[PDB]
Design a protein around this ligand. Structure first.
Ligand SMILES: Nc1ncnc2c1ncn2[C@@H]1O[C@H](COP(=O)(O)OP(=O)(O)O)[C@@H](O)[C@H]1O
Ligand SMILES: Nc1ncnc2c1ncn2[C@@H]1O[C@H](COP(=O)(O)OP(=O)(O)O)[C@@H](O)[C@H]1O
Lengths: 343, 343
């Protein structure tokens, strides 16, 4: 009767985002943001949610659920696509929460970014940054850029992910994708090796460690175009954030580096549309003659003024000068009420 | 059908720099900077890239690919020459990236350095430094110097490398080459022993550690001519860099030492030629009566002024006073626009 290899069917048939298997309820499913218990066939599940859970768990996983009452892993079904699971000892039993992994990568056009971004991928070496609150298109924006490359250039692209969100088909180039925690054990002892694996483009899924940003930066300035992703929210704060987290025995030299190596910056926030709902706000900073020198001299604040590539407001407005984002959401996402309200 | 001992053939036949074996593609190859998939015979490789990988891996290697998802090692084929590999768990499989190791050492003449450099090797003890951005001839410049010696002197030369780039034929002297990570486990507990092995010339491939530079310096001032390689870019900054990284309870005495022991300095940058492409820029500092005393008194900046052996610009120009390096690259490599532009 009960088979996870089939529970996933009725879920993918309804278009669920997440499916949850607990102990007292019948397999559940998250649809349109709601939790609905699919009693369609399965009945209140027994503490043998451990049975279904194993019909997916290897051994380095099943034993891991024992050291600590939980495991975070990804597995693939030849049926539909790939899923992300997280089994854990819930209330003296076993509970699982399978998510879903993107089988297809979006056409950069569909994203929303300008036709300027597709030029960054065409650079030769530097530090392309994509920042925003968790849930703002970062992953997608990156996979569209890394995939645009994989299509038009003859490179060996190397990505260090946790977990591998999007996957890549070998096209005009050879892609190598290592999952931090399954293929290596860190972004460092993986980015460290990326250095000596002849990769043309490196990719760190997350850069919240000194040593990580340390190398992400040493690599960016050694011949490779690296893509990094901080959780900031604006341009000014980004470049600021990375230089600040460095001992002050050369916080300026770092400003110097971040000025010779910074290839681009694109912060994002996913606001709603009076359509289906998704549209994207953002701030794009493409260094020039002045800002380059500015950053180094740290005449920061003043650089924001030269920004006639596009402040977050010249954008928070541009979406409304048409009829998409309402005035309040153009504020509940606006990095500054003051800058706007004058439009 | 598939045999790494043969994949290397078709690669060396095309003159590739790197060859890459991934999982979805057919063995690939990096030619003229490009990634080309040699479908010549091999077909889309199966996850049995682990089979080819092992037809090269010993045991202290195959097991190492298990502790961490990667191994960095060198192996030799009696066919052509020696190669550098780096196998790693890529996307739940195994991926390899074999490079290539120089079978022959260049005639010092072909390098580009003046006829002054070949005199340093003839000194009796001191600290010969070769610095530059990774990719500037350091390895080659050194192997040409260490080999010029091996040819004209009756010495026991000892080199501590990681990895052994160039190899040496016993000529008028006996060469000993230890690979850090295979023969010993460090530049220190290897340079420490070099001290008591009666070597005439010592060689540290990399000196980015206190203890390392500590001994590289204690050895240089104990009777041996040692060759070191920092990643700096100019003379002034070099000697500066090494003294600064020393607790300030005698940063001057260190300046003192670096002034009695500094035998020479030659920073490099590989610029392009309107020919095939490679020509070399550089800054050469051969201490004298003044600079010796200068360094100690730390009247640094002023020493740069006595430099009528050759500033980086008197060079960045000398290449152009002929017709090789264009004016902009004579700047995109120039350690200072100001110093030049007056030529
Ligand atoms: N530019 C965009 N426009 C509309 N929807 C987007 C855009 N970027 C991402 N999304 C959608 O938002 C969701 C999550 O985006 P994602 O990048 O995976 O989160 P994160 O920013 O943490 O990496 C996905 O369902 C994705 O399709
Ligand atoms: N003086 C030079 N002139 C022209 N080409 C050079 C010179 N020195 C090195 N090269 C070439 O540049 C490449 C790398 O130089 P190498 O010294 O091995 O890198 P690194 O500076 O990191 O040690 C090699 O292919 C080498 O033949």
């Amino acid at each position: 009767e009960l088979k996870i290899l089939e529970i996933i069917k009725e879920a993918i048939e309804l278009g669920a985002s997440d499916i949850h298997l607990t102990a007292g309820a019948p397999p559940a499913v998250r649809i349109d943001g709601y939790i609905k218990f699919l009693k369609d066939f399965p009945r209140l599940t027994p503490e043998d949610t451990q049975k279904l859970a194993y019909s997916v768990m290897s051994e380095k996983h099943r034993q891991k659920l024992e050291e600590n009452g939980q495991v975070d892993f990804s597995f693939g079904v030849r049926g539909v696509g790939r899923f992300r699971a997280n089994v854990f000892y819930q209330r003296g039993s076993v509970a699982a929460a399978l998510r879903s992994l993107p089988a297809e990568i979006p056409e950069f056009k569909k994203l929303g970014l300008p036709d300027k971004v597709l030029e960054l991928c065409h650079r030769k070496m530097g530090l392309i940054l994509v920042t925003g609150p968790t849930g703002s298109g970062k992953s997608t924006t990156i996979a569209s850029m890394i995939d645009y490359i994989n299509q038009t250039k003859s490179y060996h692209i190397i990505t260090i992910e946790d977990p591998i969100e999007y996957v890549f088909k070998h096209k005009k180039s050879i892609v190598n994708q290592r999952e931090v925690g399954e293929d290596t054990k860190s972004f460092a002892d993986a980015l460290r090796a990326a250095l000596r694996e002849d990769p043309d483009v490196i990719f760190v899924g997350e850069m919240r460690d000194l040593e990580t940003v340390e190398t992400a930066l040493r690599a960016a300035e050694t011949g490779h175009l690296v893509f990094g992703t901080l959780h900031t929210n604006t341009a000014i704060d980004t470049i600021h954030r990375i230089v600040d987290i460095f001992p002050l025995n050369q916080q300026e030299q770092v400003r110097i580096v971040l000025s010779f190596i910074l290839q681009g910056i694109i912060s994002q926030r996913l606001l709603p549309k009076i359509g289906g709902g998704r549209v994207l706000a953002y701030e794009l900073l493409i260094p020039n003659t002045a800002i380059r020198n500015l950053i180094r001299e740290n005449k920061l604040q003043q650089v924001y003024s030269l920004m006639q590539m596009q402040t977050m407001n010249q954008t928070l407005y541009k979406l409304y000068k048409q009829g998409l984002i309402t005035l309040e959401d153009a504020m509940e996402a606006s990095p500054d009420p003051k800058e706007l309200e004058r439009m």
